[PDB]
Scaffold this active site. Structure first.
Site, short mmCIF file in Angstrom:
data_model
loop_
_atom_site.label_atom_id
_atom_site.label_comp_id
_atom_site.label_asym_id
_atom_site.label_seq_id
_atom_site.Cartn_x
_atom_site.Cartn_y
_atom_site.Cartn_z
CD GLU A 1 0.33 -35.27 51.20
OE1 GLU A 1 1.32 -35.78 51.77
OE2 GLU A 1 -0.54 -34.65 51.83
CG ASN B 1 -0.91 -42.22 58.82
OD1 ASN B 1 -1.46 -42.77 59.76
ND2 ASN B 1 0.33 -41.74 58.88
CG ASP C 1 2.50 -40.24 55.93
OD1 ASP C 1 1.47 -40.59 56.51
OD2 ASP C 1 3.21 -39.28 56.30
CG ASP D 1 1.91 -41.11 64.48
OD1 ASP D 1 2.84 -41.31 63.68
OD2 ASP D 1 0.73 -40.91 64.12
CG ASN E 1 4.50 -39.83 59.90
OD1 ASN E 1 4.86 -38.80 59.31
ND2 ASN E 1 3.67 -40.71 59.35
CB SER F 1 1.66 -43.73 61.56
OG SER F 1 1.90 -42.35 61.30
#
Length: 130
Positions: free
Chosen positions: A35, A60, A53, A49, A46, A51
């Protein structure tokens, strides 16, 4: 902060992650590795959408932490996403524990499915004294 492998392994054990909701320490190590590369300040937007991380576990903003700019998001960990960018990972671990408390468990992270699931993950925690 970029953790060294064994340094992180020892910290996660002290924080009670070994076997949490059935997830062994080596799986958590595999997850952090893929990750963020064990980097606590890692963030990934991202575009698809809207959002983001955050942190070592790349949690998220749509469901877990609040950053204010993610549309129709919730804040299940009841934390500002800023808390997931600290060098001290106590808050990130507490939130990671909340995520796996959902039915999907560790599968909530697609990276775990692609790079950790059904694999020999011993290597990530081996030789760290945990």
């Amino acid at each position: 902060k970029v953790f060294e492998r064994c340094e992180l392994a020892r910290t996660l054990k002290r924080l009670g992650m070994d076997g949490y909701r059935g997830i062994s320490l080596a799986n958590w190590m595999c997850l952090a590795k893929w990750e963020s590369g064990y980097n606590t300040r890692a963030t990934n937007y991202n575009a698809g959408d809207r959002s983001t991380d955050y942190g070592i576990f790349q949690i998220n903003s749509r469901y877990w932490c609040n950053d204010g700019k993610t549309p129709g998001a919730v804040n299940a960990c009841h934390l500002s996403c800023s808390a997931l960018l600290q060098d001290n990972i106590a808050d990130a671990v507490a939130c990671a524990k909340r995520v796996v408390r959902d039915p999907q468990g560790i599968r909530a992270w697609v990276a775990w499915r692609n790079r950790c699931q059904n694999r020999d993950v011993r290597q990530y925690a081996q030789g760290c004294g945990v």
